[PDB]
RNA sequence: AUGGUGAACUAUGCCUGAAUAGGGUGAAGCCAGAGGAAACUCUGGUGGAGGCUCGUAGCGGUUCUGACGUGCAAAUCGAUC
RNA sequence: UUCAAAUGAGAACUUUGAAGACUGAAGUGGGGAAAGGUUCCACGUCAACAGCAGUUGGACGUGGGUUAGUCGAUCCUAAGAGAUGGGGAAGCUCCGUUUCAAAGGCCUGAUUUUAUGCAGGCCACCAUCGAAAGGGAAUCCGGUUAAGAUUCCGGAACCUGGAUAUGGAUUCUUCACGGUAACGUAACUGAAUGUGGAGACGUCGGCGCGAGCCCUGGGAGGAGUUAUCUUUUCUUCUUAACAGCUUAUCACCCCGGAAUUGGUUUAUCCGGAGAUGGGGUCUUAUGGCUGGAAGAGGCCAGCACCUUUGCUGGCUCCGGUGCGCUUGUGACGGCCCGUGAAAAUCCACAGGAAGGAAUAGUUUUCAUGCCAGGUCGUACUGAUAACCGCAGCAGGUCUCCAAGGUGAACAGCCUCUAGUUGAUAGAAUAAUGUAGAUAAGGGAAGUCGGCAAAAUAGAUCCGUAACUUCGGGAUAAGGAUUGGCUCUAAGGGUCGGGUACGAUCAACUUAGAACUGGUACGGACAAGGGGAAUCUGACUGUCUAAUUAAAACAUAGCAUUGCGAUGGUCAGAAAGUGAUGUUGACGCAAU
């Protein structure tokens, strides 16, 4: 046969990301010294659109604590953040939306977004529009924090990991049907070239496991094992069940 | 093309110098066999590929 | 490519020690429909610019012809 | 007069894409193009620039927001949850 | 000669028209002329004092 | 009804290949090439075009005198008249509020 | 089988440019008017939306299974589209 | 296509003249990009090539011809390419572009044995290559050749770099004044450092303004028609870069305080966060006047001549109009799960280092004055003959300018400018062909099948069903009218009143009425056939280049599956290696 489309994506030749208009690396501020013991006040200059994602980004400006310099940060804007706001980043910073606070120093039940999962990553989970994190329970000794992820997962991370309080702007971006092929054309003109999708069953056997045959059909089970190799993994990877989702999550 | 590199125009000057028939007195030489110019090139027959 | 209005500056400019040539041009213009006049332009060649002083009065224009220094190369046409 | 009965803003789609799919779009298009109230200058001049970005034409203020409405309900209940948790930490 | 003839109304009948009424003369162009004349008339009345601002305002919304 | 040609070897209608038709003293029509238009400078904070400053191409602000590129006031050629007023107001009120907080908080600690 | 050369055609992504008459229809927003047990309904303007439509340039290539078929042409030509 | 003359041994084919035509401005015209390479131009010339011819030629022989500080390249960066320090690999080499590097260089001093050692402080990015359509310092007109010109000549400019003096400006209140203000001026000290702006950006819709063209009136010239008429038809009347003054929608300042709300756009937005109004400030796109510059160019008249040739005169003026065409520009609106590059470079601001004044100092962001601006390209075609198709091939090949009429129309048809008149010709008019057509009566009986052809067709008025996702169907179906001429009515601008109207000027737009003709009139051109149903794909879109355009593929919507980063999916011989990933479940991957 021939190598298949999901195999050809790893060469990264034409399947790269489109990054001409993407604003920057939207990360958190660094954890140098002025947050681990105090705070530092910052200003929001402008909240702008980002090509590729549907959540706006904020330009948060801080004064350099070591030079006569005005180092500027690229955060993911929380819904509620406005141009001209004041942003506080530290350990003793208040519990207000827009502030950057560690998980171990916020009360249980707090709404936090842009949350590192190792202290110092400058940004991690709960980045997408309308997503947030909630603290479940602290473990003071052997400091840890129990939180829930947007996927519904419970993850324990270091108590000194950080996160902006609140929720990412742009919630509900997906409730609108695109209604049109060409609307998906512009959604993925600036994300990546993973659109459109020829079915694998509408193919020739050289080009796909599912191709061939006098009728369009799979032929064998479309549920594929973990130990399957590149070339055999096309379909429903590692599925525990399938069908229609009857019942709750049962997690 | 009008705008061209010095390599191209230099190599065209070489091909313009070489474009003319055999000198007449060479066929008058002792033990001469060259009867004409077998490397003559014209712009309408074969291209230089430079 | 410049205009100057005061006759005082023209006489100062014509002895600027970089001036070598100057021209006098005669133009027959029409102010009113009742009578034409003679409009003469005095031009001086500076190193970077040409100063044109336009004189309309015929009597004042004549006074400016001999007012030029003798070392100047005056062109009349 | 009354040019259309029920299609409203979605008249531009003509007879395409299905009736139900046209009225999911009509609700979000009505909100995303509506003019909202400025919470800083007190005027009805807030307009959507791009998804989540709502700029008030007067007083030149931009607030981060939802995709199609200025303030999503899920965000507003967050803002109150943080408040009650805040007013007890320094209670 | 034809241009002069068209000035008296000749050669403008139903058989001499190929474009629509809109194509020959746009309707929005007609309204623009109508609305601008009424506005230059109402505005001239305030300046002359022949009208107060309250009557001038209602006709503007009427016009 | 004379027709013009480009005077340069660029044949395409790009942004820096604009031409306008003029009539020369020779009685003919030539297309003379025109430089791109210049955008006004903007205030630092408000972003509106700030008046009193010449509108020129960026390289051409080097051969122009100083009075064409700035206004007399503090933060002159950079900031707006009202924005400069705004930070004048803001600076005074809270450099006077700080010395109010400074004396207020020292009173609270002194009582105890 | 070993080692090389090709994306000057063509396929797809990215970067930077460039091109695209004249009509028909008439969406939101806005104005005025009319009927009115209220509630509300109706009419006339305005406006100029749509992977809308007639139709040029352009891009294409349905039928004549037309011409040609030792051609103009190793795929073109006319009409229709 | 034709007639004639010239040349020659020879003319259907060369030249010249005349006549008849065509391309008809998204040209058979004038320029370029890629490509070619001398095809450009002159002279001589026809053995070969131009599938006839040949005196001609993009042929043959011999020569001539491309002139830049300003046009490009040269500089920056984009997607990308790619050294280095290293890490793999037996190895040719692979990864990787700031990475586990002691990674580099600028200002000012100090000595004037003097080279730059030595006083110092500042700097942390980081090789380089990569666009003749991106970004970008600066040149215009006239003339000139056989052949070149934004490059030569004449004139008039500007930019960069570098030396440099005078005038000007400023100070004993040491480093300017004026305005309430928006702000202004000829300048009007400001090191390190930091901040800001320009560079710097989508598309469509309609509206305002400008420019060129188009149309048109008077006047001063020239040409054409003139049996008759035509104060007539055609044609010239132009003003560059650069400079000074002024000119602006928007924006902003001062006064003042608003409901009987007002102002206002084609489009409905704004005002106690200060509306209306009164008065000012600013951007200089753009326009006007003036310098350039009439001395140039254009159009005519008169007088001499083998002649290298000329000379002398005039005039080159003043307006009008617009849903016009093309193009630039402004203020807005619509649209987006799309919100529509980067850097070099240039400026400004904050800051106060240092340097300074009186018998004298300081500014080269004011003016004037001085010198230099290297290298390579530049001719020509750009295509039914210069490129690619075995060729001088009915194919292919990116782009700029775009006259008048008819007409909605850069439709179709005719014409002006410009360019062609090229494709072997002659004689006859059999069959059969290709292309174009018409047919009495019938009207699909033909044929697999209405294939082919015909019919309908523009515009205005009237009228319009089933069904429907209420948006459509719909131009459904189905009727009437359409010329010419003479009239009628309505639709505008600007000026005119002690603190109703009148005059003048100018657009085609619609409606109506008589009359008139072999019942004709979207008179050529141009231009939907319609209806009732069944199968199938929802739609728009895409593919088998060169036998299949579809019920195939795509698509939205729907649904499922895997994965929280020591991860999912995938790539790699390997790697201190990689794609998604500048990503983070409203995500990425697989169906
Ligand atoms: Mg009642
Ligand atoms: Zn506001």
UniProtKB/Swiss-Prot annotation, chain A:
SMART domains: Ribosomal_L2, Ribosomal_L2_C. Its main location: cytoplasm. Transmembrane segments: none annotated. InterPro entries: NA-bd_OB-fold, Rib_uL2_dom2, Ribosomal_uL2, Ribosomal_uL2_C, Ribosomal_uL2_CS, Ribosomal_uL2_dom3, Ribosomal_uL2_RNA-bd_dom, Translation_prot_SH3-like_sf. PROSITE patterns: RIBOSOMAL_L2 (PS00467). It is found in: Cytoplasm. One of its GO terms (biological process) is maintenance of translational fidelity. One of its GO terms (molecular function) is rRNA binding. Keywords: Cytoplasm, Isopeptide bond, Phosphoprotein, Ribonucleoprotein, Ribosomal protein, RNA-binding, rRNA-binding, Ubl conjugation. There is a cross-link at residues 45, 92, 118, 144 (Glycyl lysine isopeptide (Lys-Gly) (interchain with G-Cter in ubiquitin)). Component of the large ribosomal subunit (LSU). Mature yeast ribosomes consist of a small (40S) and a large (60S) subunit. The 40S small subunit contains 1 molecule of ribosomal RNA (18S rRNA) and 33 different proteins (encoded by 57 genes). The large 60S subunit contains 3 rRNA molecules (25S, 5.8S and 5S rRNA) and 46 different proteins (encoded by 81 genes). There are 2 genes for uL2 in yeast. PANTHER family: LARGE RIBOSOMAL SUBUNIT PROTEIN UL2, RIBOSOMAL PROTEIN L2. Belongs to the universal ribosomal protein uL2 family. This is Large ribosomal subunit protein uL2A.
UniProtKB/Swiss-Prot annotation, chain D:
Component of the ribosome, a large ribonucleoprotein complex responsible for the synthesis of proteins in the cell. The small ribosomal subunit (SSU) binds messenger RNAs (mRNAs) and translates the encoded message by selecting cognate aminoacyl-transfer RNA (tRNA) molecules. The large subunit (LSU) contains the ribosomal catalytic site termed the peptidyl transferase center (PTC), which catalyzes the formation of peptide bonds, thereby polymerizing the amino acids delivered by tRNAs into a polypeptide chain. Pfam families: Ribosomal_L37ae (PF01780). One of its GO terms (molecular function) is structural constituent of ribosome. It is found in: Cytoplasm. Keywords: Cytoplasm, Metal-binding, Phosphoprotein, Ribonucleoprotein, Ribosomal protein, Zinc, Zinc-finger. GO terms for biological process: cytoplasmic translation. The gene is RPL43A. GO terms for cellular component: cytosol; cytosolic large ribosomal subunit. Transmembrane segments: none annotated. Component of the large ribosomal subunit (LSU). Mature yeast ribosomes consist of a small (40S) and a large (60S) subunit. The 40S small subunit contains 1 molecule of ribosomal RNA (18S rRNA) and 33 different proteins (encoded by 57 genes). The large 60S subunit contains 3 rRNA molecules (25S, 5.8S and 5S rRNA) and 46 different proteins (encoded by 81 genes). Belongs to the eukaryotic ribosomal protein eL43 family. It comes from Saccharomyces cerevisiae (strain ATCC 204508 / S288c). Its main location: cytoplasm. A zinc finger (C4-type) spans 38-59. The modification Phosphoserine is found at residue 39.
Curated annotation (Swiss-Prot), chain E:
Residues 1-21 are annotated as: Disordered. Belongs to the eukaryotic ribosomal protein eL19 family. This is Large ribosomal subunit protein eL19A. The gene is RPL19A. It is found in: Cytoplasm. The chain holds residues 65 to 127 of 189 of the full protein. It comes from the Eukaryota. The modification Phosphoserine is found at residue 27. The lineage of its organism: Eukaryota, Fungi, Dikarya, Ascomycota, Saccharomycotina. Component of the ribosome, a large ribonucleoprotein complex responsible for the synthesis of proteins in the cell. The small ribosomal subunit (SSU) binds messenger RNAs (mRNAs) and translates the encoded message by selecting cognate aminoacyl-transfer RNA (tRNA) molecules. The large subunit (LSU) contains the ribosomal catalytic site termed the peptidyl transferase center (PTC), which catalyzes the formation of peptide bonds, thereby polymerizing the amino acids delivered by tRNAs into a polypeptide chain. Disulfide bonds: none annotated. Present with 97700 molecules/cell in log phase SD medium. There are 2 genes for eL19 in yeast.
Swiss-Prot record, chain F:
GO terms for cellular component: cytosol; cytosolic large ribosomal subunit; preribosome, large subunit precursor. It comes from Saccharomyces cerevisiae (strain ATCC 204508 / S288c) (Baker's yeast). The keyword Manganese does not apply. GO terms for molecular function: structural constituent of ribosome. It comes from the Eukaryota. This is Large ribosomal subunit protein eL34A. The keyword Nucleus does not apply. InterPro entries: Ribosomal_eL34 (IPR008195), Ribosomal_eL34_C_sf (IPR038562), Ribosomal_eL34_CS (IPR018065).
């Amino acid at each position: 046969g021939r190598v298949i489309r999901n195999q050809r994506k790893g060469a990264g030749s034409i399947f790269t990301s489109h990054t001409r208009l993407r604003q920057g690396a939207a990360k958190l501020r660094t954890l140098d010294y002025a947050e681990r013991h105090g705070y530092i006040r910052g200003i929001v200059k402008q909240i702008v659109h980002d090509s590729g994602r549907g959540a706006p980004l904020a330009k948060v400006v801080f004064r350099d604590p070591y030079k006569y310099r005005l180092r500027e940060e690229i955060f993911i804007a929380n819904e509620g953040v406005h141009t001209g706001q004041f942003i506080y980043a530290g350990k003793k910073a208040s519990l207000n939306v827009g502030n950057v606070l560690p998980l171990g120093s916020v009360p249980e039940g707090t709404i936090v977004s842009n949350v590192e999962e190792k202290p110092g990553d400058r940004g991690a989970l709960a980045r997408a529009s309308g997503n947030y994190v909630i603290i479940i329970g602290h473990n003071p000794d052997e400091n840890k924090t129990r939180v829930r992820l947007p996927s519904g997962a419970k993850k324990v991370i270091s108590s000194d990991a950080r996160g902006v309080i609140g929720v990412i702007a742009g919630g509900g971006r997906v409730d609108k049907p695109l209604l049109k092929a060409g609307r998906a054309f512009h959604k993925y003109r600036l994300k990546r070239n993973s659109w459109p999708k020829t079915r694998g069953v509408a193919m020739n056997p050289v080009d796909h496991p599912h191709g061939g045959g006098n009728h369009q059909h799979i032929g064998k089970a479309s549920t594929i094992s973990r130990g399957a190799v590149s070339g055999q993994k096309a379909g429903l990877i590692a599925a525990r069940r399938t069908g229609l989702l009857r019942g709750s999550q049962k997690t | 093309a009008a705008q061209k590199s010095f390599r191209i125009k230099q190599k065209m000057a070489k091909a313009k110098k070489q474009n003319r028939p055999l000198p007449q007195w060479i066929r008058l030489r002792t033990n001469n066999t060259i009867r004409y110019n077998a490397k003559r090139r014209n712009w309408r027959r074969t291209k230089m590929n430079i | 490519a410049r205009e100057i209005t005061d006759i005082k500056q023209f006489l100062e400019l014509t002895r600027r020690a970089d001036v070598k040539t100057a021209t006098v041009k005669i133009n027959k213009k029409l102010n009113k429909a009742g009578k034409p006049f003679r409009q003469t332009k005095f031009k001086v060649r500076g190193s970077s610019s040409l100063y044109t002083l336009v004189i309309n009065d015929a009597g004042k224009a004549k006074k400016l012809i001999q007012s030029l220094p003798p070392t100047l190369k005056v062109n009349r046409l | 007069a009354k040019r259309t009965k029920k299609v409203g803003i979605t008249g531009k789609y003509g007879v395409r894409y299905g009736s139900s799919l046209r009225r999911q779009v009509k609700k979000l298009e009505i909100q995303q193009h509506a003019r909202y109230d400025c919470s800083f200058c007190g005027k009805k001049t807030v307009k959507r620039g791009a998804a989540g970005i709502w700029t008030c034409s007067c007083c030149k203020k931009t607030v981060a927001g939802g995709a199609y409405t200025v303030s999503t309900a899920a965000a507003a209940t967050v803002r109150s949850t943080i408040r009650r948790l805040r007013e007890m930490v320094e209670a | 000669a034809h241009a002069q003839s068209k000035r008296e109304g000749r050669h403008s009948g139903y058989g001499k028209r190929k474009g629509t009424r809109e194509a020959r003369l746009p309707s929005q162009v007609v309204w623009i002329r109508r609305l601008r004349v009424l506005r230059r008339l109402l505005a001239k009345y305030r300046d002359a004092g022949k009208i107060d601002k309250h009557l001038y305002h209602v006709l503007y919304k009427e016009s | 009804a004379q027709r013009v040609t480009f005077r340069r070897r660029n044949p395409y209608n790009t942004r820096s290949n604009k031409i306008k038709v003029v009539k020369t003293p020779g009685g003919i029509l030539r297309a003379q090439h025109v430089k791109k238009l210049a955008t006004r400078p903007k205030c630092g904070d408000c972003g509106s075009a700030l008046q009193g400053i010449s509108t020129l191409r960026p390289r051409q602000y080097a051969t122009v005198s100083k009075t064409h590129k700035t206004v007399s006031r503090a933060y002159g050629g950079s900031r707006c008249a009202n924005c400069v007023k705004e930070r004048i107001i803001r600076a005074f009120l809270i450099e006077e509020q700080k010395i109010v907080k400074k004396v207020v908080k020292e009173q609270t600690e002194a009582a105890k």
